[PDB]
């Protein structure tokens, strides 16, 4: 065979030649043998692509190896390799490129890898949270397509328990002002974040958030590898757990595994139904392989269960599965490993774990809040509403049994007439509803800051303006839209409301 590879330096080329020669010595082709070749990247792209096309396709190469140079250009190595490989629908192997935009087998019709991109390690999040009594995550994600994929994967890998994350708020990639997201995040009972995004934005959010003291006691943070890197291990408050992979930028092992897989696939494919030959020359032929999908399909079906990196098991989307990761604690700016990821199992090490704050416990991302803001609409017979006078309280009125009327302020609107803006004047609502309100408030021992709603309706279900997307407006709507928990008022139990919500047992009959 005449396999081809695109490398960064000559030691890499020598290593590749040694690996393919060792593969031949262990097991080799009958007559075609295993010839090999490696070239070097050029910082011209267009000319590097011209070079790889001409030379490699003229070389009758059967597999193409591409490795990410350690230089962080991020669109240097795999950007022209997979495209022109797919022009002839010939598969490529990934060595040290670990983004997830390539995992989508749509445009890069040919792409493999042995470095599970950063969407994979989102699986580690559930692989751990399976048994931790951790049930409230408001994780932040950037607008990068990597972050997009990691997000969607995390939502879809959590529905097996039918649970749901609270906030999945998101932000533009690599910005320098993220304080907002944070002070709305802190005004939530939830106290866990699984933010995982670009390193620069990670440092930005750390710097802007530590000012808000949310890094203090009982507020954990969850972050993966690439988000603690270069400019991020600095601003990190203690306790930030790190999630990293076992075999890092060691090219040799991955070159070995890739060439072993390619050699095994070609040797088994030497016997097959029909094997055609690559078109000769980058120019000329304008037609695809007659058998390229055969080579690719047998390449996914590759159980190469022997290697330096163990079993290089590949998943369905042309990537690598069955990887080993690491949970590592950040102990006083001195990072040391704190967990292991052998896959579907966790074996925490015998160490003194540390969180932010400084307690040595299981900080609760959950809370009782005990605020319970209340809303209610004024009909008439169950709530009497009176504009309180300029006296700081409602009034004092009495009853027959010597029991005066309870009265509390009610921060309702003042826009009953359409067009007038809601002055939100603090009127005084009272009566039957306030009576049940105060009794139940004493029952549960909390506080209320009651206020009405602007529109003044029960808020049925309807459609948004000129669209088939449905919604709930009005009072029920402000219940759903996390604006208050209790809306106690005369509201009818019906079907469409109860089909997707839960009601207390009724307190009346009508």
């Amino acid at each position, epitope marked *: 065979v005449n396999i081809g590879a695109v490398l960064s330096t000559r030691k890499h080329e020598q290593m590749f030649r040694e690996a393919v020669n060792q593969a031949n010595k262990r097991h080799g082709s009958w007559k075609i043998q295993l010839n090999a070749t490696s070239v070097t990247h050029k910082p011209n792209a267009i000319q590097m692509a011209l070079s790889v096309c001409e030379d490699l396709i003229s070389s009758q190469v059967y597999a193409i190896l591409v490795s990410h140079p350690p230089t962080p250009n991020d669109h240097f190595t795999p950007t022209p390799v997979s495209y022109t490989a797919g022009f002839y629908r010939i598969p490529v192997l990934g060595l040290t490129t670990r983004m997830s935009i390539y995992s989508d087998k749509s445009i890069h019709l040919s792409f493999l890898r042995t470095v599970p991109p950063y969407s994979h390690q989102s699986s580690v999040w559930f692989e751990m949270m399976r048994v931790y009594s951790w049930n409230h995550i408001i994780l932040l994600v950037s607008d990068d397509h990597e972050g997009r994929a990691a997000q969607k994967r995390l939502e879809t890998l959590l529905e097996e328990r039918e649970s749901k994350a609270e906030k999945v708020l998101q932000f533009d990639p690599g910005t320098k002002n993220v304080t907002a997201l944070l002070m709305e995040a802190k005004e939530l009972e939830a106290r866990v974040i699984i933010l995982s995004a670009s390193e620069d934005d990670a440092a930005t959010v750390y710097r802007a958030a530590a000012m808000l003291n949310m890094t203090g006691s009982g507020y954990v943070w969850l972050v993966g590898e690439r988000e603690i890197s270069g*400019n991020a291990l*600095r601003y990190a*408050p*203690d306790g930030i757990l790190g999630l990293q992979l076992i075999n890092g930028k060691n090219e040799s092992a991955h070159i070995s595994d890739a060439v072993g897989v390619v050699a095994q696939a070609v040797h088994e494919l030497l016997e097959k139904e029909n094997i055609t030959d690559p078109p000769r020359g980058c120019v000329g032929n304008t037609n695809i392989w007659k058998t390229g999908p055969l080579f690719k399909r047998v390449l996914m079906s590759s159980k190469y269960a022997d290697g330096v990196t163990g079993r290089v098991e590949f998943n369905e989307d042309g990537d690598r599965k069955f990887a080993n990761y690491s949970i590592m604690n950040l102990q*006083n*700016r*001195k990072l040391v490993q704190v967990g292991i990821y052998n896959g579907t199992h966790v074996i925490p090490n015998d*160490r*003194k774990i540390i969180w932010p704050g400084g307690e040595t416990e299981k900080p609760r991302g959950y809370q009782m809040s005990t605020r319970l803001k209340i809303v209610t609409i004024h009909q008439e017979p169950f709530v009497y509403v009176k504009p309180t006078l300029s006296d700081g309280t409602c009034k004092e009125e009495f009853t027959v049994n010597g029991d005066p009327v309870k009265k509390v302020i009610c921060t309702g609107p003042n826009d009953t007439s359409p067009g007038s803006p809601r002055h939100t004047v603090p009127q005084c609502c009272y009566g039957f509803c306030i009576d049940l309100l105060i009794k139940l408030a004493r029952t549960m021992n909390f506080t209320y800051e009651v206020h009405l709603v602007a529109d003044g309706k029960f808020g049925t279900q309807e459609r948004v303006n000129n669209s088939n997307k449905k919604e709930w407006n009005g009072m029920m709507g402000e219940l759903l839209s996390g604006q208050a928990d209790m809306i106690v008022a005369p509201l009818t139990i019906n079907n469409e409301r109860a089909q997707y919500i839960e009601f207390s047992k009724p307190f009346k009959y009508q």
Partner: antibody
Amino acid sequence: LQLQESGPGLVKPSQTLSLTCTVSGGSISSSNWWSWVRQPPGKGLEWIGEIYHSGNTNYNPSLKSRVTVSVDKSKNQFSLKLTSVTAADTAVYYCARDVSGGVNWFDPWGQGTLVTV
Amino acid sequence: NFMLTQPHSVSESPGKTVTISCTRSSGSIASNYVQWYQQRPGSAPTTVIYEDNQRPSGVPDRFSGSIDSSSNSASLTISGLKTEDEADYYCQSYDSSTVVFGGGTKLTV
């Protein structure tokens, strides 16, 4: 809040020296660590390691299989168990407090002894 | 890891502005910062500037740190040279592996 390394000058070779460091004005039950950076004589410095009051510790990778440090709250003091002491210990030992903070850094150093084997 | 470089010393009269520059051998001085100690001869070390941005309580405005990160020279300034400043000046930094210290800097006034 003042440190003091107990062992003044015990420099017995081929043995297990035990320099014990205690503090006044406070106790170890806090969120901070401890430091025993070593100064070669007439030369620069040489970090040894650092310990935590409750569970863990960490040292310079230059010296791993030889340093074992413990801490006791009852005596409010912490000491090492260095094994097979050699002539390399001809260098002054210190005991400085540190602050976790945002940057690893020692609070002003201790009195320092003159332990040189 | 990575060592530093302060050759041995420097000598100048009061009224000048001269101080050694701590240099990071491997990598750049941008992630894990630098910090200068003052250690009077025959005595224990004590801080003089922290992260080369602010000075500890009691340290005069005479000392001030600055960062270039291009030559990786962690610059220190003792502008306002006088006599009492005779001590050792030790640059220190740190990483997930180790904390490392300078060779020392004792000036002649």
